[PDB]
Amino acid sequence: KVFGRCELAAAMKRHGLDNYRGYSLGNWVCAAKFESNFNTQATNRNTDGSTDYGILQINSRWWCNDGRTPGSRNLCNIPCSALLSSDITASVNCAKKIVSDGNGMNAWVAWRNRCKGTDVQAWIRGCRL
Numbered sequence: 290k291v292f293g294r295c296e297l298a299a300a301m302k303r304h305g306l307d308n309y310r311g312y313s314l315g316n317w318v319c320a321a322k323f324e325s326n327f328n329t330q331a332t333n334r335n336t337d338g339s340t341d342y343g344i345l346q347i348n349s350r351w352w353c354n355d356g357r358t359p360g361s362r363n364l365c366n367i368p369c370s371a372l373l374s375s376d377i378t379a380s381v382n383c384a385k386k387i388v389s390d391g392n393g394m395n396a397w398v399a400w401r402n403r404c405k406g407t408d409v410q411a412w413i414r415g416c417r418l
């Protein structure tokens with residue numbers, strides 16, 4: 290599924306991402322745009338053999354099991370394929386664990402380089418929330 294901007298904001302808010310660990314909703318929408326172009330089916334291979342999955346590009350090195358990242362962990366206790374679903378529940382719940390781990394939203398490279406220090410409220414402007 291490829292989400293619209295306000296559609297995704299509404300879904301993220303419903304699952305409790307708005308102000309989660311101090312990060313306003315605009316931060317999460319900005320991250321999703323630049324990580325995946327709002328596409329739940331996005332995948333990208335890293336040089337070390339791991340793969341990033343779904344709307345927030347969660348990495349198979351630590352967070353999910355894809356059966357081909359030897360000696361990896363599965364800390365969200367899910368198959369990586371669950372992160373590609375039209376329903377974003379699994380992605381949101383795993384992201385909550387990631388952002389809580391000490392490094393905050395700096396875990397998402399596109400957020401650090403393209404969203405951090407900008408007017409992130411602009412990403413939810415116009416939406417009925």
Ligand SMILES: C[C@@H](O)CN1CCN(CC(=O)O)CCN(CC(=O)O)CCN(CC(=O)O)CC1
Nearest residue numbers: 350351352362364386387389390391392393396
């Ligand atoms: C809860 C997270 O910490 C999970 N974590 C994966 C878990 N393992 C072992 C472990 O952290 O106990 C790898 C260890 N490694 C460096 C280290 O921790 O010393 C990872 C660093 N990051 C996060 C960070 O620690 O900043 C990746 C996510």
Ligand SMILES: C[C@@H](O)CN1CCN(CC(=O)O)CCN(CC(=O)O)CCN(CC(=O)O)CC1
Nearest residue numbers: 351362364386387388389390391392393395396
């Ligand atoms: C093995 C190294 O990870 C040693 N580690 C000391 C051991 N503890 C707990 C533990 O790691 O079992 C630290 C708790 N904490 C992070 C955490 O929750 O693990 C601090 C961050 N860093 C590294 C990091 O974790 O990224 C400190 C270095």
Ligand SMILES: [Cl-]
Nearest residue numbers: 313314315410
């Ligand atoms: Cl915001």
Ligand SMILES: [Cl-]
Nearest residue numbers: 356357358359
């Ligand atoms: Cl694996």
Ligand SMILES: [Cl-]
Nearest residue numbers: 300376377378
């Ligand atoms: Cl959903």
Ligand SMILES: [Cl-]
Nearest residue numbers: 310392393394
């Ligand atoms: Cl933080």
Ligand SMILES: [Gd]
Nearest residue numbers: 351390391392
């Ligand atoms: Gd760690």
